[PDB]
Design a protein around this ligand. Structure first.
Ligand SMILES: *[C@@H]1O[C@H](CO)[C@@H](O)[C@H](O)[C@H]1NC(C)=O
Ligand SMILES: *[C@@H]1O[C@H](CO)[C@@H](O)[C@H](O)[C@H]1NC(C)=O
Ligand SMILES: [Ca+2]
Ligand SMILES: [Ca+2]
Ligand SMILES: [Ca+2]
Ligand SMILES: [Ca+2]
Ligand SMILES: [Ca+2]
Ligand SMILES: [Ca+2]
Ligand SMILES: [Ca+2]
Ligand SMILES: [Ca+2]
Lengths: 36, 70, 271, 271
């Protein structure tokens, strides 16, 4: 297994099911609205 | 979309030189506290129904002209 | 390897003890406190001469010193054709000494474990994770089919399950067939995925004092004491070395040549 | 050593080169200037990877560095199963090159000499006096049948005849059957009475640049130039090492296992 695998759980001619497992670094921020 | 519940910590927001203090929560005045970002480590596992060929592309960019009345 | 057919009527050959003593080397590993208590700069030469009285050629017996069990356990390098480790007993280190024995009384086929990129599992009972270094703090987080964690969060190392802290050597055994996220101090520790192939015949461990506490098998139902695990009560280190010298033939009889074809990089002291 | 009877129709076995590389090891000896010119902190690693492409498993090839021929000549220890010594050619050090090649390309049986107490003589052509150390200065006073010096005075060491001065290694060959009084700087160099048993088939010497000047036999009438004494032209050391790696098959082909049993326990690498 891996921290960033790309597994296949089903596949057809035009479509497939991809199981993505990934580690992420979510960097978010706040926005303040000021009305005076 | 990651959803977060909230638990107020020891620091208390208050307006100095004003009659408001000892109030718990997080105001909208300066939530970032001068930080360029808040960083949280996550991991996600999901199963997505995707076209078999890894060459298709859903549109990503946009040209937005909404709220013309506004 | 080929079949070997032998007749039960074949005559015994003469004693080969003298020939093997003449054509082999002996390595003795002792703690530094032994040298401290002995307090003599020529004791190596004296023991060499006594071994010569026993039969070993001058210079075939090599004396190696280690600070303690914990320090010795960091990638021990056994050189001679026959290795004897005088291991001091401590009631607080019963596991550690056992671990050391489990590392030097058995052959191990090891490969690297780059845990930052892969999640690892133990396929069978022979598979273990041997971690060695100055400080080995190993935390484990068993994962599920979606690789997320059971009773643990892959991201938060705090919630991980603690299996080792501040260790020079640790043998980790987790439940087989389950993928685990591993958090180890890679700066001061190297962890290897290892399979035990079998006993290592050229290494004997003499426990100086204490009782029988060694358990070189992770299985709780077995605590087998092989002939290579000796135990002697002691009060002076000179007596310990004298009994090692006098019964050297008995000690070597309990040992055999390594017989394994290796692929690793370790020096040896051979004649 | 029993007679071996063989039939001239026995089928050839397959190539043992692959298994030999998997079960043997190669020590490559180079001068300091080689690493100085290469100017890389991982040239050993890339050379090992290239050797692996050539067949040798990782950790099998060892790289040993020596300051120069003179320094390397002081008791050289050869560890690996196969040894290749890259010896740079200096037109002013032909005899030193020959002495080093004689020492490491041949097998010697040596015993200590007490030049202070007893006189010494060389029994036959295979008998020499090899003196090595930080600085070897050897003077010789041949004696007559009445143990009186010839052209020299036993009491006065100034009248002695100088055969070595400040050498780090020198092979002294005096007239056989004559007893000599030896004046040697025993405080800085040791002289040993040695006999040449035969060739060391696991040591090849590659002479980098120059001409064929090596002479590993004291006989004036022979300059063998055996198959284990190669010579190459060079301008850059990287090309030299690439040539060594690419043709390691031929180099090992020119060498055979040592095959000599040693009564001395020394440090070696053996996989
Ligand atoms: C074995 O021991 C016997 C009894 O001392 C002796 O006669 C014989 O020569 C020895 N060697 C062999 C090879 O049998
Ligand atoms: C030897 O080489 C032959 C021909 O290349 C091959 O068929 C055979 O398997 C090899 N090994 C043995 C043990 O014959
Ligand atoms: Ca431990
Ligand atoms: Ca937990
Ligand atoms: Ca297990
Ligand atoms: Ca057990
Ligand atoms: Ca010289
Ligand atoms: Ca003279
Ligand atoms: Ca001579
Ligand atoms: Ca010659």
């Amino acid at each position: 297994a891996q921290a960033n695998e790309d597994i296949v759980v089903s596949k057809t001619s035009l479509w497939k099911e991809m199981q993505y497992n990934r580690d992420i670094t979510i960097r978010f921020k706040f926005a303040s609205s000021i009305v005076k | 979309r990651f959803r977060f519940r909230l638990t107020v910590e020891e620091p208390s927001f208050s307006i100095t030189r004003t009659r408001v203090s000892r109030l718990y929560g997080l105001p909208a005045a300066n939530p970032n506290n001068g930080k360029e970002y808040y960083e949280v480590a996550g991991r996600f596992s999901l199963i997505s129904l995707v076209p078999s060929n890894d060459d298709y592309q859903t549109p990503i960019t946009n040209s937005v002209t909404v709220r013309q009345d506004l | 390897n080929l079949p070997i057919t032998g007749s039960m009527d074949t005559a015994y050959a003469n004693s080969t003890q003298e020939e093997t003593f003449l054509t082999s080397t002996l390595c003795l590993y002792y703690p530094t406190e032994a040298a401290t208590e002995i307090n003599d700069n020529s004791w190596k030469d004296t023991l060499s001469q006594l071994f010569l009285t026993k039969g070993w050629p001058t210079g075939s017996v090599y004396f190696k010193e280690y600070t303690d069990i914990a320090s010795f356990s960091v990638d021990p390098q056994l050189y001679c054709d026959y290795n004897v480790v005088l291991m001091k007993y401590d009631a607080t280190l019963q596991l550690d000494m056992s671990e050391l024995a489990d590392l030097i009384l058995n052959e191990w086929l090891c490969n690297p474990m780059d845990i930052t990129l892969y999640y690892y599992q133990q396929t069978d009972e022979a598979n273990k994770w041997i971690s060695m270094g100055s400080s080995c703090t190993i935390k484990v987080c068993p994962l599920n089919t979606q690789t997320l964690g059971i009773g643990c969060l892959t991201t938060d190392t705090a919630t991980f399950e603690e299996v080792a802290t501040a260790e020079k050597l640790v043998i980790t055994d987790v439940v087989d067939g389950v993928n685990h996220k591993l958090d180890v101090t890679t700066a001061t520790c190297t962890i290897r995925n290892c399979k035990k192939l079998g006993p290592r015949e050229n290494v004997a461990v003499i426990q100086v004092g204490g009782s029988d506490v060694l358990d070189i098998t992770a299985d709780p139902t077995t605590a087998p004491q092989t002939e290579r695990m000796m135990r002697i009560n002691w009060k002076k280190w000179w007596q310990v070395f004298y009994t090692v010298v006098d019964y050297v033939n008995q000690i070597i009889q309990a040992m055999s040549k390594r017989s394994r074809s290796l692929n690793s990089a370790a020096f040896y002291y051979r004649i």
